[PDB]
Amino acid sequence: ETETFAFQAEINQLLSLIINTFYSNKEIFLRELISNSSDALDKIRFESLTDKSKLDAQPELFIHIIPDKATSTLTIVDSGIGMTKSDLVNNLGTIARSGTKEFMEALAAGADVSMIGQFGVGFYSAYLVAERVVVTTKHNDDEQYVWESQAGGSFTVTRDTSGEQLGRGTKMVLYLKDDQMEYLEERRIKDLVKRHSEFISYPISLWTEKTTEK
Amino acid sequence: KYRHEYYQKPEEVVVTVFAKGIPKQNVNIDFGEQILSVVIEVPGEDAYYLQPRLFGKIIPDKCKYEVLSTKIEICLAKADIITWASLEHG
Numbered sequence: 001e002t003e004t005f006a007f008q009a010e011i012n013q014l015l016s017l018i019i020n021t022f023y024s025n026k027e028i029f030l031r032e033l034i035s036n037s038s039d040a041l042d043k044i045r046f047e048s049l050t051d052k053s054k055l056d057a058q059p060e061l062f063i064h065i066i067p068d069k070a071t072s073t074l075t076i077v078d079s080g081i082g083m084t085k086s087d088l089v090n091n092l093g094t095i096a097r098s099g100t101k102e103f104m105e106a107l108a109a110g111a112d113v114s115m116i117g118q119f120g121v122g123f124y125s126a127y128l129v130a131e132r133v134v135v136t137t138k139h140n141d142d143e144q145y146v147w148e149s150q151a152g153g154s155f156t157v158t159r160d161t162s163g164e165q166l167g168r169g170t171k172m173v174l175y176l177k178d179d180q181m182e183y184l185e186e187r188r189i190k191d192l193v194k195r196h197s198e199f200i201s202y203p204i205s206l207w208t209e210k211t212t213e214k
Numbered sequence: 215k216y217r218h219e220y221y222q223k224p225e226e227v228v229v230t231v232f233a234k235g236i237p238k239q240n241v242n243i244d245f246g247e248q249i250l251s252v253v254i255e256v257p258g259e260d261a262y263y264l265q266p267r268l269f270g271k272i273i274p275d276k277c278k279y280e281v282l283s284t285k286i287e288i289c290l291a292k293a294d295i296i297t298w299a300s301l302e303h304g
């Protein structure tokens with residue numbers, strides 16, 4: 001087909017705080033995404049120590065960052081373990097982990113939005129800089145699906161047909177807000193990566209033409 | 215066996231059984247006020263059983279399921295609009 005779910009209470013509130021307050025440290029979104037994406041690679045790797053055939057669908061473990069100046073989208077893709085549809089509905093909005101409420105309390109008590117990661121809701125940091133996010137994922141156990149939301153209190157999961165099929169993993173596309181146009185520049189991205197990913201152990205490449213960095 | 219998961223909306227609970235290429239014919243699923251029974255038939259050995267006593271109660275006539283090639287989706291219709299804390303009930 002597509003199915004529609006409404007964000008759990010807590011998460012709606014958080015999504016509001018994120019997309020409606022002006023925060024300073026918006027740049028950590030790329031950290032949180034690159035991370036959540038490392039964590040995903042780790043999983044498919046461990047699953048593969050005892051089953052070499054796990055990565056058959058797509059054998060290289062990687063992270064690609066693809067800034068399209070034209071459509072004004074920063075997009076991140078990994079060959080991580082990916083999400084089943086069930087996983088999409090459960091992690092990206094339907095279940096509200098404990099840190100969600102905890103985080104907002106902390107926020108108002110004057111914590112910094114950069115802690116959004118340490119509280120277990122890192123994913124939504126994307127809406128700091130994006131107005132629409134479109135996650136498309138394929139997990140070994142299920143087919144490719146697409147999660148999409150504009151933070152308007154609900155999200156959609158849809159089976160992927162028209163799309164170009166990933167072997168395995170996840171392709172987050174961030175349709176960037178106006179002011180946030182800076183995360184499309186090659187220099188900026190290269191900075192941000194170096195600055196926060198000095199513990200993450202897979203090839204991160206920048207397809208604003210070609211190559212990989214540090 | 216075969217892996218299972220579930221997610222929930224305020225009105226339904228959706229149990230997925232990850233079973234590749236199961237013939238529509240081999241899946242036998244029945245519903246009860248507070249039970250679910252999934253029995254997909256495996257040709258070689260014993261059947262797969264997923265036969266929990268459900269957390270909440272459900273409306274068995276409103277329950278549907280769908281065999282899909284990667285998975286079998288089962289939409290359980292919650293009898294009461296109340297969030298379940300697990301598929302099963304211990």
Ligand SMILES: Nc1ncnc2c1ncn2[C@@H]1O[C@H](COP(=O)(O)OP(=O)(O)O)[C@@H](O)[C@H]1O
Binds near residue numbers: 117
């Ligand atoms: N790129 C990705 N690949 C696979 N799974 C992901 C990805 N991004 C997010 N997820 C899923 O979203 C869940 C929560 O993400 P996040 O909000 O960062 O919290 P945390 O980083 O603490 O898990 C994870 O448990 C993971 O399964």
